[PDB]
């Protein structure tokens, strides 16, 4: 990622919650960024409450388009979940409390004053009885620190392979059940890319005709009074067009 | 941010106030910068006390435009509040006084001379009785230093997710309740961007006609006396135009 | 590779599984990337369930084309398997458990508390009886560490030579059994590269005619009602063409 | 700023004066730079003792223009006062003498020879009686060094917020009480920027006509005597014009 | 080479095999790369099983062309064998087992436990009787380490000189027995380089005529049915040409 | 400045003289550089002993022009005097002899041999009686070293403010007592800058006519004798013109 | 300068001579470089023994031109003498022998063997009696080392000021006693710079006519014999011109 | 120079010879480089044994041209001799044997075994009797090491000044005894530089006519036999011209 701006909390059950929201925090953030930026989302979403009913999409083409949104947007979180499992320190911090227990922990012998520092630092920092050793959760058993870190890295490659294979089979089934062959699909997608570009080129130049002629109609007039300058300004098509509608 | 130009104050209740104005200082500063720079603010604000009443906005379109100002301007402080909670040293410094109390603090045993240095360094530096240990507030219990720092980082991801989701639902409700569909909205916003640019292009060239002809009318004359050169200079349209109004 | 983002697990049979998925993980990932990117795959795959039967390929030309996919795509994993065997630390970590056994290991004398730390750290970390010494698997016998690392590097050059020779004999048999000579094959492949480029150039300009004339037919009309703007938008050729089909 | 070219003086009342002129020195310097560079100042100031009285500004438009000078020029010192309060060492050095008093200072026990070194080093360096400890003013109580430094940083954010809010309310009241709306103000300021540029363009080319024809009138003549070359040189419109006035 | 990604194996007869495949590994790899890239190889090889017999090369011109392949391709391995003998560590590692014998080795006195560690670490690591000292093979006698390293560097210059002289005599005999003189050979080779370039220029533009006219013949037609788009796609001259063959 | 190429002299009264000429040395040097480079100086100075009396300047316009020279040229030394007082080591070295006196100096107890080394090293190095301690002048009392260094930095800001304010009041009085207003002064100074440039452009091209025609008149002649080539060379308008004066 | 490629000699009177030729060595070298490069020198010097007497300069204009040579060329040595006096180590090395005398030197007590090493190392290294201590001249009394080094730096600023003032008064007297005013002098020097450039432009193109026509006259001829090619070559206008003189 | 690739020899009389050929080695090398590169050398030297006698130079103009060669070429060795005397280590190494004699040397007391190591290391390394101490010649008396090094640097400035003055007087006598003045010499040297350039431009284009027409005469012919291609090749004007001489 950017940097190592993290460290384990020296407590239970805060090691659970701190490590959980660092794994599944940026995935839910990158999921909503990837849905928002995706233009096929707003082809479906925009104007849904005032679209006329005979131009609505069928529910079947709604769902296959919607699945194309989720699968296109899930390349960024699974890239994040792969990185958060490779540098396995978050999985270590998630599961260190199953191993640093006060029956056999190394640092619960002389540092029992550090557990029994306050009523908070035993009871709220650990449990109702002080089950786990707090600085062991903080800095773990170095043989078990490497065991949990390496079990994390197996889970990383299991994730990237399972999501890679299932994305490969979804792509291939969307290829093989297509009604067109390859060159027909390549021509049709050539047409759609050109059509969107040429539609917006024709629209912008036609709006350039309307914007030019509206500005000349305002500045061709001499001697504007007060309410002309205020009828041009303001928040709402635009009030320049309505000013020209009365002249 | 820029750098780590900060350190905790070695006192109570100054740790409260120092940490508070570093968290909520730059948000109120970036809130007023984001309101000022935003051009939709001055479309509403400018000339409000001399606008004619039949060109005022309705209160309903005033409020939805105003909400567009606040939500566009709140991307910069919530980016700051997310950073000030990630590097959790400010939340640590805010709440260190609940934990470094003189019943059990580490450094209130030999350094009680440093609390009882003066009448100020016990009573004003801490409390009416010297409740909290001053260098413990300054440098905290290292197990509780990591507990408060990690509780801060949970609050950071809670903030970015809750503000991200609520900005996502406000955006989507402004999309789905729109009267237009997508391509009508894309054409209309194409028209408004072109219209503002072509209005200012026509205005500037028409003001270039007026500025050229006013300068030639001044320098076509020979033999200017004293009061012509002073009637051109001065603070007020412009007095060059009024000089041409008498010639 | 990128960096040395790895370390051995301090346990059995996790040294087997950790080292196995780092050797054969990125090969299965680079195999599916190399199949997907390869354009000859989608010349065969696309539209297979709706292709008419008299334009299907024969099974013989299907298989020789398919073999061209696998051999073109296997240059990237065998480059990876050569690198993972050259830096022999993964083969060392795969086979360190055959050598660090508790009959003669160096560190199973005083650190038998570290094997008998918990019920997990002997039984699940090693075996039903604690056969192997766990930190010996972690850090090995340095004379046997160099023996296994060097037996890995022999296997690397055996791999690159055997795959290089077999790719050389497959290439040469596809050269020598060709029906054409060299200059006929060079002309034919010159023709195919030009034909694909000139087919897509003619297709794109012909789709430029259709996209231009459809956009002029929409914006030549004045006074569009609501359902025209909604019939142009939407998910499906394209609904702009169908709007022109009714006008 | 540029660098840390400062250090505290080891004396009273020199810590007052040294820290005072480093805080309020560059503000008075940047105030007079910002008044001088500001062109609206010299629109009011220039030729005030020989301006004809019927082209003077009214006192009301003099004052609102003058307030525009002071508020435009006070962005640079308040940026300086914010920086001199953030790095709080100057406020520490201003108020260190209230805390390093000889009743309880740390270094007034063995180093009383260093106070009583000379008649100057006790009486002029401190006070009539030697009230304060001189090297304590120099290097302070480290718990009170952090207390004064952090009270400075609260004053910095209080300054930037109070000056930011009051500049925001002055701007908004000058917006909302404007006689024009937005687009009228945008057109008028477009006109003034063009008019100043086109006035100086017409003036410079018209002065290019006068300068060209005066130089040709000098070098078209043959055989200049001594007093022609001296009547062209000299300090004064220009004496080249007066030489042409006699020919 | 690239780097020093090597180390000796701490065993016999693995020092023989590890050093052997690092010397003669990249030569056999660079030999097959140099044969493959060489274009005169595929002038002979391509289409050999379907070339008509009256256009085959004679065996004499086959062999002199083939010798030109091997001598052009052997510049890269002999550059490698010269480098692997200059940094003489591989020849040292090849022949260290003749010198580190257990009759007089330095480290077979106290480290006889390290030979007799296991049944493998004496018998398989060395020999049927443990003839040689294993860490002596690993790190050698430093007077004999410099003797073997310097005998390697004599062999390097013997190799580069003998291959340089024999390549010089092969070149000079191919010069002096040429039927042409110099300027005739320079003109003929000028002709062959131009002829290959102008043949491929004429071929590519003539294939540009065929590819252009085939694409216009497809897109000049209106209303293609399903089987036209599938007869254009597919794996095989090309099926676009056969589609035009039926129209 | 450039660097710290200085150190105090270990003697009196050489600390006075060394520090004095480093403060007031580069000011008198930068004063004469700033007078020389200034072009208004040579408008007054040049040809003063052979200027005809009726084209002399009046003494009043001589003095106001001369004051414009001194005030324009004094920006560089006061920038130097500000820097030599900020790094206060020169003021410390100027006044260290008032404080390192042999009644109470630290190093005049054992190092009295170093004062009484020779007849020179007591009498000429210090005074008629050896009043001051020589290595104390060299390296001073560190509490008084910081007192004199900080009294210097107060004098620096007193200098930059007093010279800045007095330059501000001289500028403003030259603005407000001007006979013209702003735009008349801006036009007149536009005219003078253009007139000097166009005078020198006309002069240089007219001298290009004279230089071209004189060179053609020399090289149009054939057969130059000895004294023609010597009459062209030489120190003096120019002797080429006088050679053309006889032909 | 370039670097510190110097060190004192450990002897008398070699400290005198070594330091003297490093101060006054590069001044006499830079004096003769500055005389040679100066073009006004060779306007006077060139051809002085064969110039005809009626084109000689008068002795008065010879001397004022010659003074212009010396004063223009003395900017480089006085820049050197200023640098050799600022880094005062050469003046220290010049005058260290007046202070390191054997009556009171520090190192003439145990190191009297190093003075009395040989007959040379006392008598030739120092004096007829061994007056001065040789390693004291080499490394001096550190209080007197700083006294002589600082007396050097006073002499540096005395040199740059006295030469700067006297160059200022020589310049100003050459300005004020000029027969012309400023603009006449600026025109005349504009003419001389143009005249030298246009004389050499006319000369070079006229010599281009002569060189072109001489080369065509040589190569227009066919069949040159031996003595034509030798009459063109050779050392002498040029022998190509004399070859054309006979044809 | 380039680097310090030198060290003294630990012997006599090898310190004489090693230091001598490093001082006077690169001067004789740079003398012969400067004679060879100099083009005036080959204007005299080339073809001297077959030049016809009536186009030989006179002995007087031979010698003054030859002196111009030696003085132009001696700028590079005297720059070297100045550098080899400035870093005085070579003069130290030349004359160290006069000072490190075995009567009083420091290291001939215990290291007399190192002189009497072998029959060579006393007799051949030093002298017939072992006069001088060998490691003293190697590393010298540090007071006499600085004496000889500084006597070298006096000789460096004596060399650069004496060669600079004598080159200045040779230049000035060649200026003042010239038959021409300055502007005649500047025109004549302008002519010679143009004449050499225009002679070679006319020669190269005329040889371009001959080379073009000879190549067309060879390739205009069809059907060249064997001996035509061999008569064009070969070592000799050129045999292409002689081939055209028979056709």
Curated annotation (Swiss-Prot), chains A, B, C, D, E, F, G, H:
The phenotype of cells or organisms lacking this gene is: Uncoordinated locomotion with mutants showing reduced forward velocity, muscle force and power production.
Q: Which residues are glycosylated?
A: 110
Q: Which GO terms describe its cellular component?
A: monoatomic ion channel complex; non-motile cilium; plasma membrane
Name of the molecule in the record: Calcium homeostasis modulator protein
Q: List the stretches on the Cytoplasmic face of the membrane.
A: 37-65, 175-247
Task: Recite the lineage of the species.
Answer: Eukaryota, Metazoa, Ecdysozoa, Nematoda, Chromadorea
At the top level of its lineage, which domain of life is listed?
Eukaryota
Which molecular-function annotations from GO does this UniProt entry contain?
Answer: monoatomic cation channel activity; voltage-gated calcium channel activity
Annotated organism of origin: Caenorhabditis elegans
The biological process GO terms on file are:
ATP export; calcium ion transmembrane transport; regulation of locomotion
Q: What is the effect of changing residue 87 to A?
A: Changes relative Ca2+ and Cl-permeabilities
Compartments annotated for it: namely: Cell membrane
Q: What is the topology of this protein in the membrane according to its UniProt annotation? A: Multi-pass membrane protein
Positions of transmembrane segments:
16-36, 66-86, 154-174
């Amino acid at each position: 990622v950017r940097k190592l701006t993290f460290s384990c909390p020296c407590a239970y059950p805060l090691n659970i919650y701190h490590s959980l929201v660092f794994m599944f925090g940026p995935t839910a953030a990158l999921l909503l960024i990837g849905i928002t930026v995706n233009s096929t989302t707003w082809k479906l979403a925009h104007g849904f409450f005032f679209r006329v009913r005979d131009t609505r999409h069928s529910w079947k083409t709604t769902c296959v388009s919607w699945i194309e949104v989720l699968i296109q947007s899930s390349v960024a979180p699974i890239a994040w979940l792969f990185v958060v499992f490779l540098d396995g320190g978050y999985y270590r911090c998630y599961r260190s409390h199953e191993f640093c227990l006060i029956s056999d922990a190394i640092l619960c012998k002389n540092s029992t004053i550090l557990n029994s520092y306050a009523s908070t630092s035993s009871f709220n920092k650990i449990s109702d009885n002080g089950k786990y050793c707090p600085p062991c959760i903080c800095v773990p058993n170095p043989t078990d620190a490497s065991y949990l870190e390496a079990e994390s890295q197996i889970y990383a490659w299991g994730l990237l392979l399972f999501s890679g294979v299932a994305a490969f089979l979804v792509i291939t089934c969307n290829r093989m059940c297509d009604k067109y062959t390859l060159v027909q699909r390549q021509y049709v997608e050539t047409y759609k890319n050109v059509e969107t570009q040429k539609f917006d080129a024709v629209a912008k130049e036609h709006a350039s005709q309307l914007a030019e002629h509206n500005a000349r109609a305002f500045f061709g007039q001499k001697d504007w009074t007060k309410r002309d300058w205020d009828w041009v300004s303001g928040i709402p098509y635009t009030p320049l067009q309505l000013w020209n509608d009365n002249k």
